[PDB]
């Protein structure tokens, strides 16, 4: 048994676990070191065109330390600027994979209630970032999935549930609670008081399997669309960090190497074994993350990973360039009078091209986790995009614009203009929200004892639209 077999008071606050596990708490806190904000829309402006008419065309950055998960959720322009708990563009489900306060609230008010309402609804309740409670039982300290949608997805795909899995499988599944592709399913329900409500439930599109093509069939079967493209009016699908799904198909995943083996390597000290809880780049600690299975220079192995990244970039730039052009060319055809009937097949091609290309790049480590599937996906997506473009030349010709040249979108500025994103406006509105409602959320959370100010140190010095210098 543990030294807290009856549970931990204030379990959602990771600092409450420090008295029992100071070592893991210390390394866990170190993800604060990974504070870099890489603006992906600035690096890859083609993505802005791909996501026109969707929040990702406003703000999308690369992943950084777990220490910043909650704050980045708050800072991203995607969550907008609510003025109260009933406003703002996004739903409560956006907190789900950002805080240990999520299982706390679910276990208190029920899953459906948690998934009901606006993101702003829990602003002063969900205030702790990725913590001990998101992965451990507060009585046995054993690994556990705290979100019901994971087992639901696992079963649907023919996988064993978390409780039925081996220890090694759990070392990856705890990560899969969040590092997977998902979509919000509108769900009607009635509470204990008989009131009719509507929830937006996190759902893993795994009922037909976890391959990109199986998920695609899944979405097409239910005629689902995350949004209607702002330029091409295509019924679009958004892929979001399908880290585990692509990992499972890669060679390491097939060989049984878990997420933890590389991202949370062991350190043996006598008869005691410790897991590095500073979840980050395995390449910064290869001696413990890689060289325990591979025998050769760290530099050579690093060069090999670099090679994979370059190959992925090569195909990614081609795919998204043609996807961007297809969107713009479809928009031009619409402007000339092309009918939905004339553009139906074209739009289906675009939908599939981007779904496959996005699924390939949305998981930032996929180029390494499953190198070959990533390249194949990008090649498949590009082919769908070009099939659309070949058909588009004919539609453009019918309307007298066969020589139309889709405008360029080589910079974030030019791309956002094409996507009609008024950044200045969104940023100004965001800052006002942060200076008012956000500070009230934090003040109230601290007053109620849900938030410890110590956890806020250097947590809000950077975003894609401001940098106080160094976190």
The yes or no reply on residue 78 touching ligand HEC (CB under 6 A) is yes
259 annotated to bind ligand: yes
Q: In terms of CB distance, is 45 or 63 closer to Y ion?
A: 63
User: Which of ligand HEC, Y ion, Ca ion, none binds 301 (CB below 5-8 Å, type-dependent)?
Assistant: ligand HEC
Q: In terms of CB distance, is 52 or 97 closer to ligand HEC?
A: 97
Q: In terms of CB distance, is 186 or 255 closer to its own copies?
A: 255
Which stretches of the chain bind its own copies, using CB under 8 A?
251, 254-255, 296, 300, 304, 308, 311, 314-315, 318, 371-373, 375-376, 378-380, 382-383, 386, 389-390, 393-394, 397, 402-403
Distances (CA, A) of 59 to 177, 361, 373: 24, 16, 27
We find the least distance from the C-beta atom of residue 400 to its own copies, in angstroms, to be: 11
CA distance 52 to 417: 10
We find the least distance from the C-beta atom of residue 307 to Y ion, in angstroms, to be: 10
The yes or no reply on residue 305 touching ligand HEC (CB under 6 A) is yes
Per-residue contact flags (x/-) with ligand HEC for residues 7 to 46, judged by CB under 6 A? -------x--x---x--xx--x-----x------------
Nearest to 161 by CA among 140, 178, 179, 144: 144
Cβ burial of 5 (10 Å; 0-12, 13-18, 19+) is: exposed
Q: In terms of CB distance, is 54 or 409 closer to Ca ion?
A: 54
Answer for which of 116, 177, 380, 463 binds ligand HEC (CB under 6 A) is 177
Q: Buried (b) or exposed (e) across 443-456, using 16+ Cβ within 10 A?
A: eebeeeebbbeebe
Contact 136, 28 (CB under 8 A): no
30 annotated to bind ligand: no
Helices (H), 240-297: 243-249, 251-254, 259-263, 286-289
- Segment near ligand HEC (CB under 6 A), from 72-80, 158-166, 219-227, 328-336? 72-80
Cβ burial of 121 (10 Å; 0-12, 13-18, 19+) is: buried
The yes or no reply on residue 183 touching Ca ion (CB under 5 A) is yes
364 annotated to bind ligand: no
Per DSSP, the residues of 181-229 read: --EEEEEEEE-TT--EEEEEEEE---BTBSSHHHHHHHHHHTT--SEE-
132 annotated to bind ligand: yes
294 annotated to bind ligand: yes
We find the least distance from the C-beta atom of residue 187 to Y ion, in angstroms, to be: 33
In this structure, how many other beta carbons lie within 10 angstroms of the beta carbon of residue 56? 22
The yes or no reply on residue 241 touching ligand HEC (CB under 6 A) is yes
CA distance 64 to 22: 23
Per DSSP, the residues of 349-362 read: HHHHHHHHHHHHHS
Using DSSP, state whether 333 is helix, strand or coil.
helix
For the annotated binding site for heme c, the residues are: 66, 94, 97-98, 132, 135-136, 175, 178-179, 252, 259, 262-263, 277, 290, 293-294, 369
For the annotated binding site, the residues are: 66, 94, 97-98, 132, 135-136, 175, 178-179, 181-182, 238, 240-241, 252, 259, 262-263, 277, 290, 293-294, 369
For the annotated binding site for Ca(2+), the residues are: 181-182, 238, 240
């Amino acid at each position: 048994k543990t030294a807290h077999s009856q549970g931990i008071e204030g379990k959602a606050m990771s600092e409450e676990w420090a008295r029992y596990y100071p070592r893991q708490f210390d390394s866990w806190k170190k993800t604060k070191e990974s504070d870099n904000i890489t603006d992906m829309l600035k690096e890859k402006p083609a993505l802005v065109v791909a996501w026109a008419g969707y929040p990702f065309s406003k703000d999308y950055n690369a992943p950084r330390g777990h220490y910043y998960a909650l704050q980045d959720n708050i800072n991203t322009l995607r969550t907008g600027a609510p003025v109260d708990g009933k406003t703002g563009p996004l739903p409560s489900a956006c907190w789900t994979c950002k805080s240990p306060d999520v299982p706390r609230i679910i276990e208190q008010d029920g899953e459906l209630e948690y998934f009901t309402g606006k993101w702003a609804k829990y602003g002063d309740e969900i205030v702790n970032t990725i913590g001990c409670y998101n992965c451990h039982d507060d009585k046995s300290a054993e690994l556990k999935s705290k979100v019901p949608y994971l087992d639901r997805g696992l079963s649907a795909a023919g996988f064993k549930t978390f409780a039925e899995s081996t220890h090694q499988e759990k070392r990856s599944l705890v990560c899969a609670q969040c590092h997977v592709e998902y979509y919000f399913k509108k769900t009607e329900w009635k509470d204990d008081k008989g009131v009719d409500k509507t929830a937006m439930v996190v759902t893993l599109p795994w009922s037909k399997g976890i391959s990109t093509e199986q998920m695609e069939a899944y979405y097409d079967e239910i005629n689902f669309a995350d949004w209607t493209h702002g330029i091409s009016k295509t019924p679009m699908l958004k892929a979001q960090h399908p880290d585990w799904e692509l990992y499972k198909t890669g060679i390491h995943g097939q060989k049984g190497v878990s997420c933890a083996d590389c991202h949370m390597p062991y350190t043996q000290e006598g008869a005691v074994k410790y897991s590095d809880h500073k979840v980050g780049n395995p390449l910064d600690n290869m001696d413990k993350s890689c060289m325990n299975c591979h025998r050769e220079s760290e530099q050579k192995l690093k060069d090999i990973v670099k090679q994979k990244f370059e190959r992925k970039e090569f195909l990614q730039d081609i795919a998204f360039d043609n996807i961007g052009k297809a969107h713009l060319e479809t928009g031009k055809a619409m402007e000339l009078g092309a009918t939905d009937a004339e553009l139906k097949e074209i739009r289906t091609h675009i939908r599939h091209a981007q779904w496959r290309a996005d699924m390939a790049i949305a998981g930032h480590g996929s180029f390494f986790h499953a190198p070959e599937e990533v390249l194949r996906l990008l090649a498949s997506g590009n082919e769908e995009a070009q099939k659309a473009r070949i058909k588009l030349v004919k539609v453009l010709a019918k309307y007298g614009a066969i020589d139309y040249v889709a405008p360029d979108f080589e910079t974030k500025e030019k791309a956002q203009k094409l996507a009609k994103v008024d950044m200045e406006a969104f940023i100004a509105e965001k800052l006002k929200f942060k200076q008012t409602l956000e500070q009230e959320w934090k003040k109230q959370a601290i007053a109620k004892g849900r938030l410890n100010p110590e956890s806020l140190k250097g947590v809000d010095e950077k975003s894609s639209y401001y940098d106080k210098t160094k976190k």
